[PDB]
Design a protein around this ligand. Sequence first.
Ligand SMILES: Nc1ncnc2c1ncn2[C@@H]1O[C@H](COP(=O)(O)OP(=O)(O)O)[C@@H](O)[C@H]1O
Ligand SMILES: Nc1ncnc2c1ncn2[C@@H]1O[C@H](COP(=O)(O)OP(=O)(O)O)[C@@H](O)[C@H]1O
Ligand SMILES: Nc1ncnc2c1ncn2[C@@H]1O[C@H](COP(=O)(O)OP(=O)(O)O)[C@@H](O)[C@H]1O
Ligand SMILES: [Mg+2]
Ligand SMILES: [Mg+2]
Ligand SMILES: [Mg+2]
Lengths: 559, 559, 559
Amino acid sequence: VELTDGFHVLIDALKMNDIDTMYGVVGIPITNLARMWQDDGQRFYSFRHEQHAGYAASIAGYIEGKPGVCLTVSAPGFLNGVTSLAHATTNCFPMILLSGSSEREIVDLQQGDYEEMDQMNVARPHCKASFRINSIKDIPIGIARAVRTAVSGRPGGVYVDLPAKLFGQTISVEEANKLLFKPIDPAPAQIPAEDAIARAADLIKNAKRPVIMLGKGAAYAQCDDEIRALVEETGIPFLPMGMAKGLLPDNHPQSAAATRAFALAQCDVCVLIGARLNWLMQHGKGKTWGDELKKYVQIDIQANEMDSNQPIAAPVVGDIKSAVSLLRKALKGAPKADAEWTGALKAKVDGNKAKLAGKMTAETPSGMMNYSNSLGVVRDFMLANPDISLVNEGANALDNTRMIVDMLKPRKRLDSGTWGVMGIGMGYCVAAAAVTGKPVIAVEGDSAFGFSGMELETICRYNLPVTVIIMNNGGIYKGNEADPQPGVISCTRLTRGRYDMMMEAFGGKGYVANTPAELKAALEEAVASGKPCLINAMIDPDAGVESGRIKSLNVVSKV
Amino acid sequence: VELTDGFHVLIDALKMNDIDTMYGVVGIPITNLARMWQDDGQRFYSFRHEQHAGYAASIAGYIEGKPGVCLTVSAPGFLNGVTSLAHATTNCFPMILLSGSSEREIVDLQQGDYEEMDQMNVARPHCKASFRINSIKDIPIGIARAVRTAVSGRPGGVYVDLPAKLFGQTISVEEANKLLFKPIDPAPAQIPAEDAIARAADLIKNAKRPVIMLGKGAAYAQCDDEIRALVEETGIPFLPMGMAKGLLPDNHPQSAAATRAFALAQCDVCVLIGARLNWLMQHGKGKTWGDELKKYVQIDIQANEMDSNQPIAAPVVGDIKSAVSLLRKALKGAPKADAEWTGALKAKVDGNKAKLAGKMTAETPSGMMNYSNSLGVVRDFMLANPDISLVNEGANALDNTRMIVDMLKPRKRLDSGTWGVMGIGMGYCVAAAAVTGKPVIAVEGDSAFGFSGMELETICRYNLPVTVIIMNNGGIYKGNEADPQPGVISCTRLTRGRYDMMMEAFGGKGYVANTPAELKAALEEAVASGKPCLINAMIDPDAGVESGRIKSLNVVSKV
Amino acid sequence: VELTDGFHVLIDALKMNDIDTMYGVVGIPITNLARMWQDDGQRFYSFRHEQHAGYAASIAGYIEGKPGVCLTVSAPGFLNGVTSLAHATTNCFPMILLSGSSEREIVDLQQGDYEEMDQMNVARPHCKASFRINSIKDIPIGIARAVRTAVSGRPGGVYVDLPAKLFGQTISVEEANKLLFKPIDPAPAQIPAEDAIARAADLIKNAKRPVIMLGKGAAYAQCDDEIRALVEETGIPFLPMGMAKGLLPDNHPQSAAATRAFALAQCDVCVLIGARLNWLMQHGKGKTWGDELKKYVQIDIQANEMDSNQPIAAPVVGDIKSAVSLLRKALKGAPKADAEWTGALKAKVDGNKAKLAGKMTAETPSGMMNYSNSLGVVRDFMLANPDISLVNEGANALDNTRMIVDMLKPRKRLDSGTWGVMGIGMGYCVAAAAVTGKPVIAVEGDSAFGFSGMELETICRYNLPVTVIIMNNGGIYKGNEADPQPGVISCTRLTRGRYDMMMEAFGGKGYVANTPAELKAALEEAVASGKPCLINAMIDPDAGVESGRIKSLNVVSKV
Ligand SMILES: Nc1ncnc2c1ncn2[C@@H]1O[C@H](COP(=O)(O)OP(=O)(O)O)[C@@H](O)[C@H]1O
Ligand SMILES: Nc1ncnc2c1ncn2[C@@H]1O[C@H](COP(=O)(O)OP(=O)(O)O)[C@@H](O)[C@H]1O
Ligand SMILES: Nc1ncnc2c1ncn2[C@@H]1O[C@H](COP(=O)(O)OP(=O)(O)O)[C@@H](O)[C@H]1O
Ligand SMILES: [Mg+2]
Ligand SMILES: [Mg+2]
Ligand SMILES: [Mg+2]
């Protein structure tokens, strides 16, 4: 009777759930899992730190709608991975963290095992569910549980603990075949009732000044034409959140993105589609919303997200594709939004965009670009080459890129997200390249970059078509903060370094860009090369402001 | 400008969410909340221990489909309540535990505050969500969050922490009335996709030996007529779980309850409606399922419950009412289940019921009734008086009542549930009496009763129409286990006590029943009286078996 | 080769660590552990609820200085026990909760096992350490870890998870003998440095108005003569906390207990011996301490208890026996405290005691005793019969007993403790009787009693020499709060019940006491009988005040 083992049953179960890629870092007790995964013909991306393998997994989940899978070792490796899992869960990205763990007997008596930790218990605050697979016979069910939990309801992170003793267990191939199975419909549709839709429809029809807010939940849903149809049929102005950019093209005539403050302050009805009324929307409170309670329509798969911050006048619970489809039919043939309202917003958008144009054409000294004339080059490039992932993080580097760089296609913009995480950059690049097979451009604050910068080597090792643009202003927000004391560097300063040389250290191509012309030539060559590149963009140390757009959130001393 | 305070804003927010009843125990810092609730005209039931207030709240939730509300003090009182909250979440019963807590400054520095505990964080494993309301202005949103979390998705427990400093905060009546609101549609319908229903219809139409399993989730859904219609139109034999008894009348001709072992072992398609494939169903594994994987159809609102134990061939995710309605329509005109299958089960049920009838007719010596002839009296009574809640817990006292006492009406049988909790009895009695305004009968094992027995005084104090039957066999399972050493009583023995005298001690009516005839007269009189009664049923100490029906789950020494 | 099993190895390991008694409730999967424990000749006390078995265990730990052991079943049973474990840890009482748990495979995949819970993880906030013993071979080490953690450092609770699969494992007797071992010195002495003692000595010598505060840590230490020698040699006035009463006799001439407010407010140096500067001492802040920072000496085994609330001028870290012994030698021959100070306090003590005498002699109508003339009888009895445990809980019933009933012997008074827990009463009685072999008297508020009252049956079943005095005032604080609405009883009301009849229901002796004379005759007969008794003491419903001595801690509405 022929036998197989835990290693192979796990490999088979993952494949049966349509996993063909893992992101991780090897070591005891999972090195041979990664090896045999590769031997079987599957993809393993080895990173320089598990956190970045984890961030890769998180965004693979977002882009594909199936869980990104991260593989780590026990205690120290797991901890690094779980920080990323926490980020996945916060952002509603489907992800499975797989980690090796040590001996149950020793760990449970806290005796000081190799990399000792109750990883299953430690994971709980950071994921939807934390499981452990103890027996070879339970591998298929365990992986099914993990996948379903990751992709159903509000998508998010799942931890699966894999004790070292699992892998060496054996079972007959006959019995293994009998246990292996593919879950049916792991991310089911959830359809709202007619009266929930009708309530929303009535609110929208009676609105004088409606807006639609598209969140990354709407982008994640992959029902791009449904959402575009709703916007265009209703004639309602829309606003995208950071990663909802490109769901409809950012240059769509009904976009009110360039007059956000006025749009939100003056609207009466606001339709939230896969977007939380959280800190990014000032909790539906304060001067952002004209110091009044708006009439909110909200479409969300998570029932208890309703009334989290402000009373929701028309809650619609279900998956966005089902709900928007029904809402469209409910609104069939209804009058479009008032031309006075939409025309007023468009006039402001045109005016503000004209002002931005002026800023982007401004001339600066060599090696002293500002955020407008530098990012203006990236804007033009992305308008001409929209089928490219745009990774973005920083303060000024984040906010100005969100403003300036129009996305024409969905799920291309990948940024710091709900927790405003610095560190997602290089991991996001690896996963974006891996899952799309297309180029990636990253616009990185120089501080932001340092959180994941060593993964430049990972990007070179896999010869990925990634161009990293460092917005090198020489520090956090600014690069010119004075020494607080004699010979003492300010805490916000960074070396205005040759990141180009660091890229070249690992076989990539480096550029220095001192002017917009040089940045343009570098970017065009870099993307065309299809090879790993870094462009060191020399930004004026005085160009940025404190915390970018969220300056007012800082706590300052008054004594 | 007229002011109000946290006490009143909280009272009003609870009322806006249709809460008119709390179960609790008073003390610092919440006595005056309870007082003002009563002063306002709402109901407060004071118990002798918070655990029983908590169990009361949990079953109020099950019966009504709105969260039962428990009020406790800080640390020691909170802990008692949170054990019941854990039970509620485990059983999918909607419940809100409200507890006072101490000073944030002192507790957060672990300095030894009055009843010091981080109750919010301690609650987390035992509920769907644990919240704290710090500001008077957030009371309406906080309660909305709690109610929505309790009743939406899979219903369950929610903890709401109320720091002592909340209640004395003040606000204008004008501003408070602006903040107060009623959540729209807190427990929304969730409708499954057409293909999910079609997959279920296909399996049912091709089944040779189908069964339908009804769980307490089906009962909770309150679509009794729809479920009965599905059963009757398909002609499929059905089996109720413990608290699904009465969803369809237990004497319905399609019930296979009296031939459960054969039905489950021999079936091909099994339709799980609001019932988990957990320990109560032996995880869909082993001898009880003929050592094979059945074709499971499952209807559940919790997406990731699918494939928790065995592969589910037709997962139907959504609320049971919506799903059953669609499934019915998907099966319209299909032939009824095979007559040789349904005929075979009916013959077995008829034979088994005949054997049980023989047992219930058995004659026993005075003071030495067995479980059949004693519970046969309760059976006849409940058939003549079906509009009464039947509370039940114990081992033999539980299993034999579930078998013998037929329920004709839904949501009347209230038992130990998913964790097989001893302790639910008297709390369940108070809540059932309070929410139904009708009589309650409790069939209690004598050990079972001791977990909540002090609450007889609560039952007497509120003059509730509750008749408690103590199955007094003098111990756990049996009352005759030999002294393990000379002069040393066995750990399983209990005093064969005068529980009637204990009831009389608090103004209740006490009876001793030594024969079925005495039990019958006592029960009829007690229920008819409309007063709090206890019947001390004298059961043969040798009548029961080890752990009743779950004898085989015991761990025994073989050395 | 002869074999033994998990059951027997565990029994042997417990005995080797000097455990001969467990308190618990049986059921799957531990019934046969309890049975075989009894078969071996050890004591098992079966309760009616695990919480009270747990409270028993906690106080057995306090009285004996070795961990009280509580045994429960999985999930629901464990939860009940862990509430008591949390109380043990809060009070620094050594305790081990042993609980059965279910199948690792099933529980770890959250599949719905019998009584499913990660009990090990759930216990963590409530104990010093939470362990699980997976393998038969690790039982001796596991029990050693539990005992050491329970009794060393700051004593407290420990949870040991015992999966069902442990008990049936086998091992050769030869190998079992080799693994069994007794831990060496599980509660070691910890001796402070000379300079720590010298600092304290200097502070004490230079004090003008010193006081010594004795906490229950000092009582727990069992170095009664060391502490008495320190007090008498220094001539410093002392004050006992609630359970430190009797460490020195409460009628000792240097006791300042009867002038506490003045003593604490006017002292300059305060010596804390096994007593935390927590809420019981108003955190060393406010008018209790004359609104100033005192010069604190503190002796405690827990280093980081120092500076928890107020700066400690002379921290002495180590075990109380070692520290007090060294301090005595450091103070050898030093002048006694100023006679002006000690004489001033004694004059106030005599005056206040004379006033109390007047109250205790006061005459009241039959069935309307107050707290002074009723508890005056208990005072006289305990002065004449000091070798009796005095259990005490309630509000007015607690505070007035602490004031009125002088303890002459150490570790006899057992009360609500650090969390002011209602519920410790009947469990405390069982353990006190079990470990002392001497009588127990309980003074119980009627509300307090209801939290554990069913355990009267447990007290009768084991024929324990326990006399329960119910301070029956008919409610919480008072028994006469008006109906808030027509026909609606106030939340603070309780049935003024015949608790005497409840005692007699289970074979105990009941008394009703309407006057001090009747209370005295009843108490003398009850204690002399050596049998289980309850005295139902009829207290004036209007005698008590809101929350007793902590009235000012209540939160009251001002609108
Ligand atoms: N397929 C889906 N259908 C409906 N709602 C979804 C779906 N996927 C995610 N969501 C919801 O989308 C929301 C995402 O909000 P958020 O991350 O705050 O977006 P943003 O940051 O763009 O505003 C979450 O509330 C989540 O429950
Ligand atoms: N309204 C509802 N619609 C669909 N499923 C529900 C609803 N309410 C509860 N449920 C589900 O019902 C199930 C109850 O199962 P369980 O408590 O195991 O029942 P039983 O013990 O009777 O078999 C849970 O899985 C829960 O998610
Ligand atoms: N043997 C011992 N030696 C020194 N300190 C001890 C010993 N046993 C317990 N303690 C300490 O005694 C203190 C007990 O304080 P607490 O419970 O607040 O007493 P009280 O409530 O009587 O004031 C704890 O800080 C604990 O660390
Ligand atoms: Mg920078
Ligand atoms: Mg019994
Ligand atoms: Mg009282």
